[PDB]
Symmetry: C4
Subunit: 389 residues, 4 copies
Amino acid sequence: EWRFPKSTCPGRSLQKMLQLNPHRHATAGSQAATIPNREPFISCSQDECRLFTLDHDVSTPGAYDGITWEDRSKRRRLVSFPLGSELTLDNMKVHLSGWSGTACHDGKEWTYATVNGPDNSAVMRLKYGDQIRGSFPSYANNILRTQESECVCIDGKCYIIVIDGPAGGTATPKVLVTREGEVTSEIIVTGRNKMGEECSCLATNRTWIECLCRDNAFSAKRPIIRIDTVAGTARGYLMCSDTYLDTPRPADGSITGSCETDGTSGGGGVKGAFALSRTTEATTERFYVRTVSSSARSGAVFYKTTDDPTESNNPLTLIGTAVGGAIPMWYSFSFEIPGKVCDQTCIGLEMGLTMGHQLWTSNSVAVYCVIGDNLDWDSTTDVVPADIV
Amino acid sequence: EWRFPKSTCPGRSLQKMLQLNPHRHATAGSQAATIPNREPFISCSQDECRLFTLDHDVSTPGAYDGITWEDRSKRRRLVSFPLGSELTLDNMKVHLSGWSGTACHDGKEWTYATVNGPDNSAVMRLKYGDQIRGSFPSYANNILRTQESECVCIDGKCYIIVIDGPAGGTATPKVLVTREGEVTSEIIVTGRNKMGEECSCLATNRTWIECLCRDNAFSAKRPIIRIDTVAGTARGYLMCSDTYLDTPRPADGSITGSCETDGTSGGGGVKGAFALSRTTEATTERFYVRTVSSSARSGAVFYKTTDDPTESNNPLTLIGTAVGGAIPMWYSFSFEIPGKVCDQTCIGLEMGLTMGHQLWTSNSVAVYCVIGDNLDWDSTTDVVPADIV
Amino acid sequence: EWRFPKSTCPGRSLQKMLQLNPHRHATAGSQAATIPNREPFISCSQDECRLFTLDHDVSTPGAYDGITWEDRSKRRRLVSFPLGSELTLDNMKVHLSGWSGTACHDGKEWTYATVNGPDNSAVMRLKYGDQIRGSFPSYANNILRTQESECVCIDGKCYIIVIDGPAGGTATPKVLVTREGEVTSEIIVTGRNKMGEECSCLATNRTWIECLCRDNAFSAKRPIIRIDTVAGTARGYLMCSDTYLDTPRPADGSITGSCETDGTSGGGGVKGAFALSRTTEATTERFYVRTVSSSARSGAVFYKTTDDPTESNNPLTLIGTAVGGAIPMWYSFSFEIPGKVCDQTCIGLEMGLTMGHQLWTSNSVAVYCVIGDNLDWDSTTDVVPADIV
Amino acid sequence: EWRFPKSTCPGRSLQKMLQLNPHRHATAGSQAATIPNREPFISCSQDECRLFTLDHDVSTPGAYDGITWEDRSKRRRLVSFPLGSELTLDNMKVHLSGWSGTACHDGKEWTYATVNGPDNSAVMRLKYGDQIRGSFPSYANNILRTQESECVCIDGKCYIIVIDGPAGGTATPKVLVTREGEVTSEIIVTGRNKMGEECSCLATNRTWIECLCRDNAFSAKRPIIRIDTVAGTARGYLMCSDTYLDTPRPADGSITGSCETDGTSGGGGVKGAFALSRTTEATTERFYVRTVSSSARSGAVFYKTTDDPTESNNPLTLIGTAVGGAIPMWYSFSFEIPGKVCDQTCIGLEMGLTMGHQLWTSNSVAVYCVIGDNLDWDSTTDVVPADIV
Ligand SMILES: *[C@@H]1O[C@H](CO)[C@@H](O)[C@H](O)[C@H]1NC(C)=O
Ligand SMILES: *[C@@H]1O[C@H](CO)[C@@H](O)[C@H](O)[C@H]1NC(C)=O
Ligand SMILES: *[C@@H]1O[C@H](CO)[C@@H](O)[C@H](O)[C@H]1NC(C)=O
Ligand SMILES: *[C@@H]1O[C@H](CO)[C@@H](O)[C@H](O)[C@H]1NC(C)=O
Ligand SMILES: [Ca+2]
Ligand SMILES: [Ca+2]
Ligand SMILES: [Ca+2]
Ligand SMILES: [Ca+2]
């Protein structure tokens, strides 16, 4: 029947599952039509896992693929591939037009959501199975956008974080509550709620959800949103650890003040992710990623903690480097693999590939899951963008 | 069991679902074998939706693709693609040879129909599952042809509009009634029945069907056919609104006379489409498309009304422009997505692509469905036919 | 449960279903890897129909495709494609190595059979589902070979005609009786049994099978084999009609003597096919194909009769020309589409494509089924072998 | 329910099933993106058989395919293809990153295992369905590696041989016992246990497994490991027959001493394979492969015996040559096709293709199964590596 959160598979670290690298096949002499894309993420039903991403209505090599740097356009679609299929034209499935996306399976059907339209009056449409069952219009009229990673479904309701408002100022997130793709309520996020883009979300137990977000205007600390799906409420916090997770960021521990103090820098950011261990009642361990560099989007390093991230300033504990500091690392995303016996959470890593400013842009995706005792290996792309034809 | 019409999902406007644009992948350097095609449409079972179209036994780029402007030839086939698969050779499924097509799912099996043969003695064959169960010969011996959009199945019987006769004069439509692909009766269309090509058809309630057609000889107003599937009868009308839906057309409201008065121009036309909202007993709102231009096939504009289109001359109400007037827009088609709880109707738009008179010809397909409160965005192709290799 | 012959769908003629033409996609500029092949045929389960053929371990365009004229080699395999999929590399499924093939579904599993090995000691292996369950060795040690069209399964047993012996002399056919792919008996063909290659076989009622074969040494009349699956017996006849079906052949009616008189020419031949109408008790109409030319493999013409073909010399009745006499036509094959209500038989046509003697060789496949009242249209390829790259 | 070993299909020899040869499609003019690979093997569930192999994150033709000679790198993944699909990019499924692999189906789910990481601290991860359920770290810190052929599942537990330690000295194998992908015990291999790489494993009856391995340091005789899955024990032996199966090897019978005497040469080796006939209680016949040459990896020859291979020095009995001595032959692997009535074992042959030392490297795969009475035909590739583009 309905999907709900189970206790997770035992595991005390992150180890590599797989990597997809389509543009290895886009060199001189190759015969493949690969799909350049950005903002990828994975979502799973109990039958299959799928790689979702936002394409550009074009393949590489190809004469139109010079637009792949744009964030928003009439060409972008939420597409997906079965997880493990390489990212080629024939493997691709188009779900909805739009330039911001999310998707999640509720036990019976896929829900797909994208935002579509001009910056000042965009509309989120939600697709349930084959039908568009929901529509949610822009409420601040300034780039309505969503998670760029999977949403979370519990007991037949799916929970989606949207934000609308300036990228460099106050923009308030909302939680949309959907049943069969129709928006049946909006939860107001209380507490610390002046920012919260591109949230990566996971259930922390049977009835609660925790989202790790990006503050693009005010702070190098990541906002966190917790949802109590029974009470129907959501509260925002600021991640308190001295190990600041956003990029760019100042040195560790140097933001003076309370947990929820912004600090003086804070401009810019990148979507971050986390994974966890849990029982039916509570989360027992958390796993976090951030870049090697504190000013550029390069590298990826893993950390862990058994503390509550909204109320401890202790540094996180180092797991090790998953992408060397010389390698572009951009978004990362959380997801959960439902199982019959236990569930498992994972972090995906968008290893970025680009020829430069407003030139060809795409990525390779590496996946790490909660299992084992030590980090097993770092990941590379071995794709030189100059060699892409 | 059998498919029948349900009440529709709530919705008060048209919003974009998705777009397919295969020839974005047919530029210099690309690795894809795309499928040039015309007269596309979508039909759905409860498991899957499919994009149907008439191909030319060729792919683009390719040395034989210069024939894709022809309407009828021994090369054309009704093919289909899972909806969301891009239109490439490996994704294509061939169903029947022929140069006019339709298809619909009855709850248990696909029915596929095409017309095949020389202009003066063509034969419609109907395929049910894997077998050809029905054959219907030409009765006026002058291009037997059909809807170029999905047929409608109710309680195990499927209803198909055919026409046979001169393109610039009187040609009488018939309704074929099929059970498992075998033609078990013909309903005579009474009333206004001297034309009626390329009908887009939707159930208006539990037991009635309404088709919106093209008068190619006499009128800029669109013919409408209503079928009472219980009584086994069909009656033709002329759409009465001052907002004439065909192309070319005179200015709005300027056809003098009764509802069913032709007007003085009327030569030519294009296949049009509509969508609707309904309960089990009656249709509550209708949605219509026409071109921006009143003399060329360019642009697409949406309208709506709560009036009966066969008995009111009130202008329709503007929803907005879905394809800018500078963009070729050709056929459009209706279809319905069956759901477990509710059904949903949609309009697809054939955005035409061609190098010129008797040169390479194909299209991009944009899809809008009944949902939400306002139009979300217009569609473009960003394909320049000169760049197609 | 098990497959058995049902009464057929009503139909009094042959009308076109579809055509596959992969090498339309093998011209200059094309992006497809098409599969050159020969001896194709179709076989169906109740879920799906499939196009089987013998490939050459190569695709076109390609530097190794110059071997596709060979009849037998270590490169050839029995491969298949879902019926309606075009014949490209990614759509292909390899079943067994070998250079003579057949396949049929028994209601539960596919049986696949090929002959493999050197001319003087070849072995037929039979694959049932995923396993090789049967092996049948050469008994005359001179090119053991089989039908190159589907076999027939009745009540859990499948029936396969093999021949072994000189191509220009006496070679006796056997009927192999298989259960789950294991050869459980051999039926000796009595009567007229000195030749019988490449048999096209169809059930004539609930318990009998009729095969139409090729005499390569002695006669322009086609041999016919009837199998009584209950009694476990098979008897050979010579087709008696004045309308000789093989190529080359003398003029109609000019073979003097009894039904089973060879006539003076008779050297050479081509695989022919037939279709039929039947009830559970008896065959009511037969449909036959032969070439337009009486000396070359060009064109295809349809005929019918309600007579017993082993005991009447009446000419057959003309249906019309399905492939014009200027178009190469090579093998043709019978097959049957099982249905829940009724079955349907069909003829496929191998429209040959070649650059010349021991150069590139392949084909296009056109399909006609028993339905309707008149022939609907002839078929062409519009492939010029010189344009294949 | 659970998979367990059945009695095998009757058969007294090895006959060819099929061959996959993707790089036939990688010549000048071809349109295919083929997948260069090494260490392939086949594993089957009751629904499907699959070809597994270790890829290099690249396709051929292509500018990055010059790395395909490396044994271990961050690019390699365990991928698979449905058996009979040709080895192209669109057909490929990625399961896990890593450079040593194995996989087996337990009746309900696939288990996939790879080793990943640096030479001195590699980690085996095990994937069960969609989840990584098991992790097993390196215990000798010197290239943890596994079978490169299918594992064996009996009554819900799967058995995997791993080895860790020097390639030219003593390295002790362990048997990992897995349930739903989690390592629930390790069986210590007693007896002759100082080597044992790349084991090909088959059940010998209802409760016992026999593995045929490679001694890379000490002996031209192959090690054999037997597992009693009920008692939970494993014992190593040295294959005693005078017909030494490894490459390179001295002349037959010339190793002086007991069964378990190494002999004086013994350096180097290749993965070998075997097939068998069995009842529920015991193995009745064994089938073995080795190269034609006793110093190079070229050719393949089949043998059989009804003796116990750990306790008889009798020569094996010749079946015949499956790959001529002029053709590179590298790894071979065992696998078993589960059936509803009977099981069947087979040998696959990695026919190697390479341009030379540290240049492009891949293979063709030929498959032989236990059936029939005599060998049917030898296999070739007819791929000249110089012609690969
Ligand atoms: C989940 O966690 C929240 C917050 O700690 C708690 O209030 C709630 O009771 C928990 N749910 C269960 C089922 O224990
Ligand atoms: C459907 O509409 C027709 C025409 O308005 C009407 O006659 C018929 O009764 C309706 N059907 C139902 C089930 O109400
Ligand atoms: C099928 O036909 C044969 C030959 O005419 C006849 O002997 C047999 O009785 C028929 N089978 C049935 C079930 O009528
Ligand atoms: C399988 O073989 C082993 C070794 O010969 C034997 O001990 C065991 O009893 C056998 N199993 C069965 C079920 O006979
Ligand atoms: Ca920030
Ligand atoms: Ca008109
Ligand atoms: Ca002859
Ligand atoms: Ca050795």
